[model samples]
Target: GLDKYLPGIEKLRRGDGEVEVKSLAGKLVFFYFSASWCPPARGFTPQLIEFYDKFHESKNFEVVFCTWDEEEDGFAGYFAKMPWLAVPFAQSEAVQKLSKHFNVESIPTLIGVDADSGDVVTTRARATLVKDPEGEQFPWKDA
Candidate 1:
């Protein structure tokens, strides 16, 4: 499913090393287009973490982050709360392909894509997340 869009994708964090992106098979993947320097991200990220803690085990959910704090150098500290995954600062070109594919210009844009078909589920995922606290955001009509 990820063959064309996110080819050879991988994720990383401080404590954890490289993780094979294929492990998220049949997952409902969300791209968190967020930055550490942004005010909205500072507030919104924790909320995501809260929900992440709930769904990480129960649901086939995953988040791969694209950060703008790459230039600011504070992403390591600010990104500590995220229990999900991220494209490392100096890594390969997938982040560019995706950030442009989604045409993300704002902070904290949550783009949800289904892993099975690589179908884009929603671009207003943050709204879906916020409005539907029940976490039933997968319904297309709801988003």
Candidate 2:
């Protein structure tokens, strides 16, 4: 699994790291695109944390965050609090560019890819948007 070969987002927060998908042959890779500054993220983080807590030990799942925060500090602050792994801010920009290539129009999205084939299993898996400790808003849904 990529989780085995990939050091995780915590590694990026520490400074720099890499996750060789080629090394992780059979895992399900979750490319979670998010931003600490986004309202949807504020609402979603706790849920994501809860989800990760439940799944981390039991499933073959690993998250590689592609952050949408405007600056390093914002991404770093959020990454510090998150339990998942990230692809580093430098890598995040490239991910965003790919998001553009894919025509992403929103935040808090996810792309699940096969670790072995590099084939997308799913695209546009948006985190559920609901009220949170910090208020939230989504143009696509009524609050």
Candidate 3:
């Protein structure tokens, strides 16, 4: 499980607070690698929000945003607009480690993982989201 790869990592709740990743066990988790200052990330935020709204109610999915912002204020402001959870701004090392784990070289990358075993279900999650915004075919197969 990611508990080993991402030890001690906690997600920031919307509004204000933190939650253990274990709380999301059994759901499909999306590791969202983005930053507030990235233009592409900004553009994709709405689409991600839309997608989240469609599936969040089912309680079968969740997003853990690993932001690349340089300042706490930027992370706070950016995350405020998101309905999903995020890696706390103070955990910069965890964020970077996650990005490296996914080999994410671009902003707005979404990596889908099976939470129970931490197995990556797909790396092309952005494309999957774009192709099926309603999440009708979620936990998309690797392309």
Specify the highest-lDDT model's number: 3
lDDT of 2 by residue, 11-113 (tens): 4332244544443457666667788778867767777677666664555656777777879888888888877777777666566665775566787876666
Stretches of model 2 off by over 4 angstroms after superposition: 1-23, 127-143
Model 2 scores a C-alpha lDDT of 0.60
The models' CA-based lDDT, in order, is: 0.73, 0.60, 0.81
Q: Which candidate is the best by TM-score?
A: 3
Ten residues in a row with the worst lDDT in model 3?
4-13
Looking at model 3, the pairs that clash are none
Error of 2 at 104 (Å): 1.7
Candidate 2 clashes between residue pairs 3 or more apart in a chain or in different chains: 9-85, 9-86
- Model 1 TM-score? 0.85
Per-residue alpha-carbon lDDT of model 1 for 26-59, expressed as tens digits? 8888878887678877678777888888776787
Model 3 lDDT per residue over 6-108, tens place: 6876555655877877788888788888888898876788998988887776848888888889999988998888888887777879888888888999988
Worst 10 residues of 2 by lDDT: 133-142
Instruction: Give the distance in Å from residue 51's predicted Cα in candidate 1 to where it truly belongs.
Output: 1.0
